[PDB]
UniProtKB/Swiss-Prot annotation, chain A:
It comes from Homo sapiens (Human). The chain holds residues 76 to 225 of 299 of the full protein. GO terms for cellular component: cell periphery; cell surface; cytoplasm; mitochondrial inner membrane; mitochondrial outer membrane; mitochondrial prohibitin complex; mitochondrion; nuclear matrix. This is Prohibitin-2. Keywords: Acetylation, Cell membrane, Coiled coil, Cytoplasm, Host-virus interaction, Membrane, Mitochondrion, Mitochondrion inner membrane, Nucleus, Phosphoprotein, Receptor, Repressor, Transcription, Transcription regulation. One of its GO terms (biological process) is negative regulation of intracellular estrogen receptor signaling pathway. Residues 46-49 are annotated as: LC3-interaction region.
UniProtKB/Swiss-Prot annotation, chain B:
This is Prohibitin 1. Keywords: Acetylation, Cell membrane, Coiled coil, Cytoplasm, DNA synthesis, Host-virus interaction, Membrane, Mitochondrion, Mitochondrion inner membrane, Nucleus, Phosphoprotein, Proto-oncogene. Belongs to the prohibitin family. It comes from Homo sapiens. The chain holds residues 69 to 204 of 272 of the full protein. The lineage of its organism: Eukaryota, Metazoa, Chordata, Craniata, Vertebrata. One of its GO terms (biological process) is B cell activation. The modification N6-acetyllysine is found at residues 60, 118, 134. One of its GO terms (molecular function) is complement component C3b binding. Residues 109-136 form a coiled coil.
Length: 150, 136, 68
C-alpha cells in the first residue's frame, strides 16, 4: 500500500480569466477557488485525479465559470450586479469541482476590469447634472454682479 | 495519461468575418488502452504534434458559422461545439479530452465598438442635453 | 479564530453610477466548530483566499443601488 497523500488541505488557486461580457466588454476577472478533495470520494478521486488533483481540476474550471458568468452581464451590469456575478460563478464552479471529488467552500471574484467608456460616460452624466447647479447660482451671482456694472 | 495543458491560439474569421482570435484547451489524457497505438503511430510527443493543429482546425470551422456578436451572444454553443469536436478528434489519436473550451476570444474593432457606441451616445445624448443648460 | 484584519478596497459604480471607491473590513474569526472544514475546503490561507473577493462582490452590489 502506497500512502496517497491527498492535499485535502483546501489549496486555494487564484486563477484569472479574461472575458467578453454579455455586451462583451473586455472584462478581466480573477477567482480564488478554495478546493478540498471531497473526502467521501477520495480513493475514486485518486483513480480519477491523483495527488496534484487541484492543478488537475481548478486551473481551468475556474476560467470556465468566470467566463460563463461574466459573459451574462453588460460592462456596467457587472459592477452594478457584481454580487450576482460572483454568486453565479461560485454556483457553477462548486458543481464543476465536485464532479472530481472537490468540495469548494468558497469561490469569490477577486478583481474586475473594463476599458473605461461605459462607466466613464455613466460617471460624467452625474458630473454634469450637478455642474448645472454649479453654474446656476453663478447665473444668480452674475445677474447681480451686473448691477456692479450698472 | 494526464490531462496535460495545451493552450492553442487561433486567428480565424467569423460568419460576419470580423477577425476573431480564439484560444482553446486540449485537456488530453491519452487513452490508456490505446497508448500502444499512441506510441506506434502517434509517438512520444503525441500532444505537441497532434493536438494544436486539430484545435486550430476545429475552432476556425466553428467560428466561421457565427457572426462577431453571434459568437458570444451564443458563446456557450460555440465553445461546446469546439469542445465536443475536439474531444471526438483526440479520441481517434487515443486522447480523452475530458473537457475543452475557448480560452481566448476577440474580434475586430468597430462592429465590436459601434454597437457599443449605440448605447454610449444614448447617454452622450444626456451629456449634450445638459451642456445645453450650461450654455443657456 | 482571531478576527484578523482584512481591508479590501473596491471600485464600483453607484446607482447614479459615479465611480465610487469603497473599502471594507472582514472581521473574520473562523468558526471554531467549522475549522475542520475551514481547512478541508478552505485551507491555511482561508482569509486571504476567501474573504477579499466576497467583500468586493457584496460591496459593489450594495453600491449599485444608491446614487452618489
Amino acid at each position: 500500500q502506497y500512502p496517497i497523500i491527498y492535499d485535502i488541505r483546501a489549496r486555494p488557486r487564484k486563477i484569472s480569466s479574461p472575458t467578453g461580457s454579455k455586451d462583451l466588454q473586455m472584462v478581466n476577472i480573477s477567482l480564488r477557488v478554495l478546493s478540498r478533495p471531497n473526502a467521501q470520494e477520495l480513493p475514486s478521486m485518486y483513480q480519477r485525479l491523483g495527488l496534484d488533483y487541484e492543478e488537475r481540476v481548478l486551473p481551468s474550471i475556474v476560467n470556465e465559470v468566470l467566463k460563463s458568468v461574466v459573459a451574462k452581464f453588460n460592462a456596467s451590469q457587472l459592477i452594478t450586479q457584481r454580487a450576482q456575478v460572483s454568486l453565479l460563478i461560485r454556483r457553477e464552479l462548486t458543481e464543476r469541482a465536485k464532479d472530481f471529488s472537490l468540495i469548494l467552500d468558497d469561490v469569490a471574484i477577486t478583481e474586475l476590469s473594463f476599458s473605461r467608456e461605459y462607466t466613464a460616460a455613466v460617471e460624467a452624466k452625474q458630473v454634469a447634472q450637478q455642474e448645472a447647479q454649479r453654474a446656476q447660482f453663478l447665473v444668480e451671482k452674475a445677474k447681480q454682479e451686473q448691477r456692479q456694472k450698472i | 495519461c494526464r490531462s496535460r495543458p495545451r493552450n492553442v491560439p487561433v486567428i480565424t474569421g467569423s460568419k460576419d468575418l470580423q477577425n476573431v482570435n480564439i484560444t482553446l484547451r486540449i485537456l488530453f489524457r491519452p487513452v490508456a488502452s490505446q497508448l500502444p497505438r499512441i506510441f506506434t503511430s502517434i509517438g512520444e510527443d503525441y500532444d505537441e504534434r497532434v493536438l494544436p493543429s486539430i484545435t486550430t482546425e476545429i475552432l476556425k470551422s466553428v467560428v466561421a458559422r457565427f457572426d462577431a456578436g453571434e459568437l458570444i451572444t451564443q458563446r456557450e454553443l460555440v465553445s461546446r461545439q469546439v469542445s465536443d469536436d475536439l474531444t471526438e478528434r483526440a479520441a481517434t489519436f487515443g486522447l480523452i479530452l475530458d473537457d475543452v473550451s475557448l480560452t481566448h476570444l476577440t474580434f475586430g474593432k468597430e462592429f465590436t465598438e459601434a454597437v457599443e457606441a449605440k448605447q454610449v451616445a444614448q447617454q452622450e445624448a444626456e451629456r449634450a442635453r445638459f451642456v445645453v443648460e450650461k450654455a443657456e
